[PDB]
Amino acid sequence: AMKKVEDGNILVFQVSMKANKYQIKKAVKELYEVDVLKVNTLVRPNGTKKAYVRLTADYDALDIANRIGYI
């Protein structure tokens, strides 16, 4: 997941099962004030929904990932 941050300019989050692409695209924009190009989602085999969030080219993925703290 850290390999996809740097080349892809992509964050990776875990999302509650009831949410869809319109709510991940809205909530990431609200919480971190960082615009989203596209959202991809899938359901893990253990039963929770993963979400691949690709930020726009203006916003960098490493610098937002330090503000939340995971690295």
Binding site: V43, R44, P45, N46, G47
Partner: protein, 50 residues
């Protein structure tokens, strides 16, 4: 079945999370009668029947 429905897939996620041995610290509690996992499933031996 590679084109599975969600109702079947939700039950596979429960059978995966139950597919584990017993934790080591439950061995040490007071008045432990639990010795091994008696409800352990394996895909090889016993089919889970949907």
């Amino acid at each position: 079945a590679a084109q599975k429905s969600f109702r079947i897939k939700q039950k596979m996620a429960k059978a995966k999370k139950q597919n584990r041995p017993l934790p080591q610290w439950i061995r040490l509690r007071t008045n432990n009668t639990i010795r091994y996992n008696a409800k352990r499933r394996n895909w090889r031996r016993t089919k889970m029947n949907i």
